Symmetry: T
Subunit: 150 residues, 12 copies
């Protein structure tokens, strides 16, 4: 399985800004942890990582995934979760499993973070576990894709 | 007349995804149908087609149209219809006729599709006719631009 | 094809009142223009025109259309667009194509004009083209009814 | 007892349109069933049936009932339930028992059907039993009018 | 001056129903009082009175007034005040002074009576004076029409 | 047929408190009246009555009904109608006919009583007939269960 | 009869500012016109005029009116109409007739002017007649106070 | 570690009702799967399982957990997620990690399921993975409790 | 006088959890303080204390109070204040004085705590005084019950 | 301790107007009762009483209290409770205990009385006990100020 | 140029209360800083400073400014920004430039501070710069008044 | 100090489109005016100017500023002010002073312009001064950065 990991606006600043709220582990470190989760698990998974601050680049990437290459997406759309009907539509149209991850619990913050157009379009959502959420999503994606093969 | 046809996020997937809702005619096929409508009508129209998943590329394109080249725009902003005040402002500022087209009837879907900032900025709106909407928009634009010349 | 053209409350005052907003072309003139569109197109269309200020007369007329006589409706429900669930239900129940036309762009006026119960019930909606909208609707209806025959 | 049965907009299409939602029993058939309920019950009831798509005709009829002739009303105002403050006022002013019936459960459909101005004005409301609701209303009206005589 | 007095749904029941709220003076009595106000004032006014429970009949009547006959309207639209965008549009389009009267203070009742589409379209509104409101409206109309002549 | 009659919070106080609004007939008296309706009708119905002030006891009881014993439920959830998504879900999951009864017209009281999650989940709803509503519900349930057998 | 005329915030600028919207007749001129209406009518009325930009001074004045001196109030609370629950309470507590006047039609302006706490507390409201509204209010007050004496 | 697994209203019907939406795996089967996840992982975890349809029993259980016995809770509050401020407070007061699981994606259903008072009180939330969500929660809890020990 | 003191969900954790917000005085300590207030005052009061996390147990207890034993209730419904229409109805139906106490100022916290269905049903409400509120309520209840005896 | 008792708009009319709702005890009588509560209690309290219908006079008075003279405020802001952010800010800025009292239960009246900006700024709120509320507030203030000294 | 500086409710407490949020610079100090800005700039400006906690005194002052004396106003209406339609109207009617200043960023605080009726009436608004905002406003006013002279 | 000036969507059209609302001074002219303000002031400021119609390019630029090069940002996000939570987050995360400027008063336009996510994230906001706002922002930034150095 190729699994695409899409990281949205501002995620590249992880570990460098607002450590109180988002922690001290960087985005690159999360990606190395995900690799280690696959390698140590001997999972038949190839991870591709992609970060961007552009809505259009997320949509382009999701559309790129219409192919025999990629079998699922794990996405943290950042602030676009709450605003991007376009990304939500791209997810709906992807026709492959998509899992949404948030570092924080978006039910427990400002009112404007409670809506997730993208999350509503995803099969499942994981929030509030920090970096561990991405490993949870990896566990879940492997299990989903194996279920679909069976 | 040069008429610019702008197609927004996800429109490039037409005919390939969710055929139940959006049909089996591709974006390229719609564009060939529009050309055929002009050629068979002997209309003095040059069509330029542009698709993008980027809000900023739509705005750049609309601004590009401030010129003796282009006389009107037919636009399907996709999901940005409901979210993009920036595109709505660009339309307001274009100072040339703009017609909004939607494949679907955005009054008859989710509540979040009912608002169209962009449509409110356009002279007219056409929705719910599938690909035929673009030919309706072409008919209308030709008639508007001929009225303005008179 | 028999196509029924239903014009709602206040439409009979067109061309005589508020010309700034609704123009100087009368309702009778629009109807003659629609005929000319059919005759010059050699379209196999018989138009029937009906105007009324009564919700109940619109519903009676729509129900009248349950028959081998009429194959589609083009309707401008006027202000009843925003208020009449009853007309919306009649449209839903008609089981024939219905197209809604507005002279003005009802996305670009008072907040109370944005809701269209009737438009949500229609296959398609055309707004903001003035009288030309009715010819667009005629073009569209002919194409829809020909598609259904095929 | 004279009991007036008022059937609102679109009810005359019952059994002929949207059978999935509203069933295959016609309005005339419901009225014959109500008669049979009275005759087989030996109830001292004279039914008068009235259907109309006009709000004003419902109000005129309700006002007609200010008389020694009619002792109660069973009404299905159709879509006017949700919109007609005027009919609600007529009901309030009738000074005789009025029972509202809906074929469908208007709590379980679109948000715009949940409000019933007319139902709020009625003594009681019955919804979601299809045609049987009218017999329930008949049972209830007989019992109410007998209680009032005692 | 011909002044048209339009009385909306349920007004014909005045004095006969809910006397606690609407009083014991009938509609016919109000009309005789208005005549007496004109006659005793030696006002150069011809009153025409019209009551109806039909929205469409109000609109037809208002349109009838597009003429050298009638110079102003005093209207109590009843419950249609709160619902009828169509009547509000007819008033806007009338191009003659229109005054709205309510017997009751519609600011001091149910929340659903607070909106008056028709009142917003009228030059002025009078509410809460019972039958006296109509004489106030007559005083006002005479003064307005005399100001316009000067 | 076994028919389960579930009476929710505060119903056990009927006839003892607030007689102006809820009447002077006790809950036990309503239950005896329902029995008499069955016995005098020679209906093949076994009634089981259950009252509780506990949401969880209502849900437990509804789940108890997943069995060859009980064929339908008549429920007055009291105030839980407006609040209990859990009871609404239990009703949805019951897979047997459920009818909601209210003594009062919950469209005609405080705004907070207008929502009925439970009523939306029920096949039908009866409100505003006082104790008679339960007999109406019994009539209806017998007719529904006989229709299902046929 | 002593009639107190209370003029609220900004009314003292009438005729001097925004003549397009509020006209060119000053507050002092309106007061002289009201006197002339009484004198020419030989009405047994003593007018007292009071203008202030202070909510507390309006309330003090209204309370001052608890006395054999003053029999009614005509009030234009200006912008306090929309905000002042305190003035609304003072009006409720006055136990004498109070009539609210607005120069403009507060149904036809900004959304924030539509609410009138004070108007809801008044017996009647007059709006949209400019200065003439005050004479209408005077006519009405005389008639109300004469009715109360009878 | 003792981990308490709390299952709320209606969860005991899993696998027996509405399999389309909630699947065919029973609650007991999920619990055996969780045990197998611990046993096969050689995790130092003792699971305690508790299901109830009572809000008060959930709160009692959570309070029971104030002790050296239990170190974390995995909870699916069912419909109480959307309604129970009391359970949310109990979670806040527990002073131990709590993870919320939903079988379904509560962002993608009825509007009334979008609010989760309980989820906002939890450290993290997992939704839309069916039974697998509970294993994800187990993975997460073990990792959280191990982090806290370090 | 027997005075029933009802303490709702989570109150039994007082003094043990979240001392910053709710203080360090336990529920048992508050109850001993209330006794001391009665004993030192030589008040003719018998206190009965009852805490529960169950809505149904509160309602059962309130209904228990329909008797010559208990003359008033002091209640802190906890989180049920904001949610429980059922408890509010039980209070309305109790026909004895009920006083609501909150430790905290529920006007000064989350928006979801501002509504108190139960408080609206109570004669009076005391909030924000911590444990002292219960003594204030005791002072008040004694004075109310003595006034009723006179 | 000097305790300032501030009474807001309309409170000076207590006992003279609307006795049904606000009772027959005057403001002066409440103040004498408060004195008697202090004198009979031998409390070391000096009361200062201040009533005004002016928002600005309340704010001036509260600011006056920034001094060694006054140690706490008991305030009934009347209708300004619901409207005055300015008074709420003055309370926040006072840096001394402030208790809000309402005669009536402002949770149980019009929707517009439910918001209390001032109450949210106060340490505690007492409502619905009539004049007794002020003695409750006095009891509470003495206890608060004694706690602060310790 | 005479420039009037109006400071609203509570501003006189600046530097003495809540220094964390509003700083330690007093109102008098801000006024001396503004003078120094004019003197050091050799600006042809005469400053007049006015602080008050009374809405009516602000309106009186603004009206005072209708004169050859004063050419512009810099205003911080304090909490009246969010509530005072009357002050907003006075500003609209002033017919001279008015600039609104807030010490804090009123977009970044409580929801109830986001609305500024007064700010909407002003030419420009400055917020969130503390005392420096007043010097920014002075810079701006000088530039505006010089532009108007040219 | 390096100060970054970020200009958002559509700002590049300034002076060329809608001069009535946005004036005739171009963006390049504003930038030259800002330079002149620095040069004539002998301010130790290096301005960098950046305009874009892309949300992602604004975020990239803001992140670019995490460096010893740039010390503050002046931003006009255009229409993204009202929509872009992503840009608001980037501003929050920048950890350097950011000032928002709008040419127009966004409190005085369409309702949809009133929300500014970005402005809420900024230290301060300036609106309604046209091009002068940018010089005000420059004055302010210099003063802020000098205060931080001290
Ligand atoms: O919790 C999450 O994962 C969010 O998706 C919630 C979003 O509401 C928010 O915009 C953001 S911003 C962000 C990266 C912040 C990093 C430290 C620089 C993550 C998220
Ligand atoms: O009906 C339309 O034309 C819409 O503009 C309505 C928008 O709400 C929606 O986001 C989308 S997505 C889309 C392309 C979908 C294509 C099959 C891959 C079109 C539209
Ligand atoms: O733009 C349209 O076609 C509308 O359907 C929009 C509706 O909101 C409105 O009530 C009206 S009124 C009207 C006839 C006005 C004619 C000059 C006398 C048309 C319409
Ligand atoms: O369920 C009901 O009885 C309703 O009153 C609910 C209303 O919301 C609705 O407009 C309609 S339309 C209708 C007649 C439909 C018939 C098959 C042609 C009934 C009703
Ligand atoms: O106060 C008024 O004049 C109203 O226009 C207010 C409307 O809200 C209401 O529907 C009605 S109904 C009515 C006639 C009632 C008559 C005794 C049978 C008048 C009015
Ligand atoms: O009208 C009904 O049947 C209601 O279900 C409506 C609900 O809103 C309400 O909580 C209550 S309370 C109740 C029992 C009251 C009994 C005299 C002690 C019934 C109901
Ligand atoms: O139309 C009315 O009478 C109003 O009461 C409506 C209010 O909304 C408004 O604040 C104002 S301001 C005002 C005096 C304006 C005068 C020319 C300086 C009157 C009114
Ligand atoms: O998806 C979930 O896990 C939910 O927590 C979502 C809730 O909104 C809902 O009430 C319910 S009902 C339920 C058990 C249903 C079982 C088949 C009988 C689970 C849930
Ligand atoms: O302030 C109050 O008294 C409240 O009634 C306000 C409610 O909103 C809240 O749910 C709770 S929770 C609670 C007990 C908390 C105890 C330390 C474990 C009290 C209350
Ligand atoms: O109940 C209370 O104490 C209130 O603060 C509630 C407020 O909403 C109301 O404006 C008023 S008016 C008032 C004095 C009324 C007196 C008999 C002349 C008190 C109050
Ligand atoms: O930030 C501002 O300038 C405000 O105008 C915002 C308003 O919302 C607020 O009421 C207040 S209160 C105030 C003076 C507070 C001083 C330390 C005693 C200023 C303001
Ligand atoms: O007033 C401002 O500075 C705004 O930021 C307000 C925004 O709501 C709006 O989208 C726009 S569009 C714009 C550039 C318009 C230029 C003439 C082509 C500026 C702004």
């Amino acid at each position: 399985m190729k699994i695409l990991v899409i990281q949205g606006p501002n995620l590249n600043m992880l570990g460098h800004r607002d450590p109180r709220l988002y922690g001290m582990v960087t985005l690159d470190q999360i990606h190395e942890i995900m690799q280690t989760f696959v390698k140590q698990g001997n999972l038949d998974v190839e991870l591709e990582f992609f970060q961007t601050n552009f809505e259009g680049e997320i949509i382009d990437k999701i559309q790129e995934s219409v192919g025999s290459d990629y079998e699922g997406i794990i996405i943290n759309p950042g602030a676009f979760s709450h605003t991007s009907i376009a990304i939500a539509d791209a997810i709906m149209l992807a026709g492959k499993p998509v899992i949404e991850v948030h570092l924080t619990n978006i039910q427990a913050r400002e009112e404007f973070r409670k809506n997730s157009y993208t999350g509503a379009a995803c099969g499942g959502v994981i929030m509030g576990f920090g970096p561990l959420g991405y490993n949870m999503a990896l566990m879940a994606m492997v299990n989903i894709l194996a279920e679909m093969k069976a």
